Symmetry: C2
Subunit: 379 residues, 2 copies
């Protein structure tokens, strides 16, 4: 009766919101494995609270701490990169892939190959290994469920088994901190101001690279022609995305910013479940605004568009190059508007062959990073 | 392959939009029967255009004209109230119930009793005979699909087979022409200032149209009254919403083109192309929301109570309203009187819940005489 559950990256924000829903219904779920990287405390605590079968700490050096933290406990202990992959293969009917970056690609792909249900929080997967990821889903009949806000909104409004019914998919975007800033002023932006907030996430938001990546991710998740995707600027961020059908009918997913709504969706799918998420009060909201994205002020959107259009290792290169360029800006080595410049340069000087395995992906990423760092230190 | 189709009230706005989609895909549809009241021209035309099996003119007086208009045609001709009910029994897999008011209750119920698919445009149905209509739906396993904007929007965001997944249903409302007018100024409004003739226009101004929609929604979705909410949204681009237990709210948005919801009901469970326009959010710019003023539009309160009370309540209110409105238009009463009359009648007439359409026709007729009486007291 209990549905077995595993969470890769159980100690981050997603991992937390996830366990929050699992522990509220501990009677419906049987936790198999929980993972963390260096936060042995939360990991062992979470493991013990849910009476998980295994707890894995990524960092091999923290192996003895986990083992000691779980002393007298029935939870098994493990550490290292391989242990993550092994935990992803333990057989959980529902797996939350919350380990981000190249570090979670192996585990995520392993979980997918198991053919059960995989809630994807690791969006980066699709940008660098989208093609492979989708092949494995097709091959193993895996149920892939997007956890991220935009893709989850789209999924809830999407006609699965009938892509042909979609006229367009609108990915709403807040616009970022510089939604009303001129290119001229953006040139003088400092890492301090750019990150000001409610690290890299902040900067991808400011350059709108996060929307370029989300578009790429959506492209692989929904298998729809690129010309059917649109980015719509909507400051309030209350509408999380929309899908227009052939009869002109447009379905939209709206709600508060509580991550437990989408996570709750992916956790209960195909059924729905209660989550303490707040009920959007349209009266206090009063207003909703919409405008077109400025492709001239945010060229990253263009770089993203072309990469997918071109295909192959393009998006991988772009994303890798962005990592370098953003870190440079933060390290005050470059100017804000240079980030998109470096990414564009790299995309033009490095165009490897499409990946066939994760090993190729890891390679391209590493190469792109080296190429980018080079160009980055030219001007 | 071609799906048999029948349209009751094929000559109105709804029927027109419906035939528009049918004729654009005439290859997948085989029209069985088309119906009209007195517009023999459009009816014969539509009948001939779609190579319909039969054409039915409601007014028995116009029988010869129709028979004339379809001369040399393979379309059979028929007229009279009974002919309508008979046409609704011909067996069409998909039926558009576009006949308005008590005049279409018989045909609509007969179509529903055939157990296939019935696109409901006759909102009336549910207000006056909601209980009966839904019983027949359950008894014959009929697929009932709401055609009006608000209910169709809700249906597309609704978790059928799981009503307990819904936390609330929000019925958006433009707010009507007097959304920003004071009770004081509404008191002196003239019937001319409230048609942009049109009755619907008045129900819009008094917000009775939204009370009625809430009643119809209650019957269509079978969810506790306390779960329905009315939200004023001037732009009217969001047609209605449904909040789920996980906080997630699904909303149906789009252009005002009726072919969208009609296209939805025509293709369900599949989707189909319709010339409907793609809402351009860039040109829309903004969307506004505010709570409905229950004090400035008591009609909303009369509606709530009626459903709350139940039985013949809504039926009486709706009937009472019909008279009160016609009175205002005939300049016999003031604008703010309309809600007064309906209020009075509901209190002086409380028959027993209907058991058949015969009871319904009765209550309506009674409420109408009761209302007309009270109407001419002040
Ligand atoms: O973003 P957050 O650090 O908010 O969450 C990251 C999540 O990823 C896990 N994680 C972070 N880095 C790695 C890594 N290199 N390998 C495996 N898991 C990792 C975290 O472990 P823990 O919280 O230590 O970071 C945590 O569960
Ligand atoms: O609103 P509209 O008059 O716009 O459309 C009403 C629709 O209802 C039909 N109709 C009107 N009155 C009756 C009646 N008494 N019985 C059956 N059908 C009717 C109309 O016939 P048509 O418009 O001829 O009246 C038309 O198809």
């Amino acid at each position: 009766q209990p549905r077995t559950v595993t969470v890769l990256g159980a100690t981050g924000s997603i991992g937390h919101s996830t366990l929050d829903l699992i522990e509220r219904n501990l009677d419906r779920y049987q936790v198999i494995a929980l993972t963390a990287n260096r936060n042995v405390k939360d990991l062992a605590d979470a493991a013990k609270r849910t009476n998980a079968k295994r707890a894995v700490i990524a960092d091999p050096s923290l192996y003895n701490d986990l083992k000691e933290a779980l002393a007298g406990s029935s939870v098994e202990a493990a550490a290292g990169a391989d242990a993550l992959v092994e935990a992803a293969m333990m057989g959980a009917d529902w797996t939350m892939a919350a380990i981000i970056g190249c570090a979670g690609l192996k585990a995520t792909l392993a979980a997918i190959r198991k053919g059960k249900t995989v809630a994807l929080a690791n969006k980066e997967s699709l940008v660098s290994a989208g093609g492979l990821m989708i092949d494995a889903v097709r091959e193993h009949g895996t149920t892939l469920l997007p956890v991220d806000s935009e893709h989850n909104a789209i999924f809830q409004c999407f006609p699965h088994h009938n892509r042909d019914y979609v006229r367009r998919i609108i990915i709403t975007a807040s616009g970022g901190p510089f939604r009303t800033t001129s290119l001229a002023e953006m040139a003088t932006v400092t890492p301090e101001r750019a990150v000001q907030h409610p690290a890299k996430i902040s900067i991808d938001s400011a350059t709108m690279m996060n929307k370029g990546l989300e578009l790429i991710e959506a492209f692989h998740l929904f298998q729809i022609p690129l010309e059917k995707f649109e980015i719509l600027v909507h400051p309030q961020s209350v509408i999380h995305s929309m899908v227009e059908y052939l009869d002109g009918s447009i379905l939209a997913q709206i709600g508060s910013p509580d991550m437990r709504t989408p996570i709750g969706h992916t956790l209960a799918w195909p059924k729905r479940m209660e989550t303490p998420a707040e009920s959007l009060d349209f009266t206090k909201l009063r207003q909703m605004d919409f405008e077109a994205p400025d492709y001239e002020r945010f060229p990253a959107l263009t770089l993203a568009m072309e990469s997918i259009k071109s295909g192959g290792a393009r998006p991988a290169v772009m994303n890798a190059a962005n990592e370098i360029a953003v870190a440079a800006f933060l390290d005050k080595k470059i100017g804000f508007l240079d980030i998109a410049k470096i990414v564009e340069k790299t995309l033009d000087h490095y165009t490897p062959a499409t990946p066939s395995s994760l090993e190729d992906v890891f390679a391209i990423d590493n190469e792109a990073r080296i190429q980018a760092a080079a160009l980055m230190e030219s001007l």
